[PDB]
Amino acid sequence: MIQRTPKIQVYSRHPAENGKSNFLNCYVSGFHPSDIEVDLLKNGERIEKVEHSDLSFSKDWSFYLLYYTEFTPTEKNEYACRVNHVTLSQPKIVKWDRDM
Amino acid sequence: GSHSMRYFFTSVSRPGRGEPRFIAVGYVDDTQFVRFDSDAASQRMEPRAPWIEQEGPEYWDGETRKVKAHSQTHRVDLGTLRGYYNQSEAGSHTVQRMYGCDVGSDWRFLRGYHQYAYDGKDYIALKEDLRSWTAADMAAQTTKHKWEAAHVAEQLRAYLEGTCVEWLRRYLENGKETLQRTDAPKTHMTHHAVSDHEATLRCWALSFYPAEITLTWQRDGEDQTQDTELVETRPAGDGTFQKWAAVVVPSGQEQRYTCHVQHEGLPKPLTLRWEP
Amino acid sequence: YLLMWITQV
Ligand SMILES: [Cl-]
Ligand SMILES: [Cl-]
Ligand SMILES: [Cl-]
């Protein structure tokens, strides 16, 4: 029973452009075991038609998933990824920074 | 160059909450092409790349049949493992398996493999000679003795050297337009002042395939594998990949730093320069 | 193309 904390990246599929549709991505990798809660947030609220990749894993056996939803960024809206996992003492919220 | 076929399986027990979850995914190089999920509704091996949609009914019936037999072996394997380790049958446990073959440039067998994990740790693996096993602990020794007596490596070896490679090839021909492509990275650099005497310089690689890539920063031509920050490569979600490497530099010294990008899809490696 | 069968651990 190893237990590994999830790493998280929040990004978009194409370079972001206000008013132009895109995909908001949340990539969780590095974690074990596989039960994991991920939501994408618009202004603090969970988005509803969020899809995800099939569970797969790396050479060290740790897991990875891509969660993603279609969206149109605008300057008034903040987006995040909220991930809960048995290795976390509380949900981790990672804000989307456009100009990483 | 070289190419791979790989299936990954994850099987998780769920006592008190339903039957074990099983998920199977196949890949060729960095492209997924099939999957099965016990919780999904089709209950069929499903295509996830366009070239595999070419295949007819005999094929999908057969892959579905086999993935269900895999599922069933794993369902039994969770029971045995819990017995081997004298584990209370009231806990969620995880089995993982990966097997596959690689071929070189000439599309001929290079290498095979078959790894197995229990609760996130090596349990048993076929060694590179395709002939013997590495067992991580006494439970795995029991599996090894059994598998030795039943001459399992041999059956596995015939697959890895035969069928695996013959279908890898088939998939590569049929899916030539995508699998044998390279998407060269689109690249660029951003500048970010953090204080009166520092700036974060970031190198960006976008829209590339396959995933393999190296982004490195050099000062005056000398490598800086010491103080760059590198992110793990991530999927774009469209079948391509992305990565950045950042370096925090003293103000006024930007023109001295350069980013170099090695990717299979580039004629020669890229030097990106801070030229005003 | 999967293995035709897998053997119990
Ligand atoms: Cl939207
Ligand atoms: Cl892979
Ligand atoms: Cl789910």
Author numbering:
A (entry chain B): 0 to 99
B (entry chain A): 1 to 276
C (entry chain m): 1 to 9
Article, verbatim:
WT β2m is a well folded 99-residue protein, adopting a β-sandwich immunoglobulin fold, which is very stable under physiological conditions. β2m is the light chain of the class I major histocompatibility complex, a stable ternary complex that also comprises the heavy chain and an 8–11-residue peptide bound by the heavy chain. The MHCI is assembled in the endoplasmic reticulum and thereafter transported to the extracellular side of the cell membrane, to which MHCI is anchored by a short transmembrane domain. Human D76N β2-microglobulin (β2m) variant is the prototype of unstable and amyloidogenic protein that forms abundant extracellular fibrillar deposits. Here we focus on the role of the class I major histocompatibility complex (MHCI) in the intracellular stabilization of D76N β2m.
The D76N mutation remarkably decreases the stability of the variant protein and dramatically increases β2m aggregation propensity under physiological conditions. Also the crystal structure of the MHCI76, in association with a nonapeptide, has been determined at 2.65 Å resolution and compared with the crystal structure of WT MHCI (bearing WT β2m and the same peptide), here reported at 3.1 Å resolution. MHCI76 pI and WT MHCI pI produced isomorphous crystals belonging to the orthorhombic space group P212121. The asymmetric unit contains 14 MHCI moieties, arranged in two juxtaposed heptameric rings, a previously unreported packing for MHCI crystal structures, containing 69% solvent content. The 14 MHCI76 pI molecules in the asymmetric unit show negligible structural differences, and the average root mean square deviation was 0.29 Å/374 Cα atoms between MHCI complexes. The D76N mutation site is localized in the β2m E-F loop, a region far from the heavy chain contact interface; accordingly, no major structural effects induced by the D76N mutation are observed at the heavy/light chain interface region. Furthermore, it is worth noting that residue 76 is not involved in any crystal contact with symmetry-related molecules within the crystal packing. Our data show that the association within the MHCI has a remarkable stabilizing effect on the D76N β2m variant.
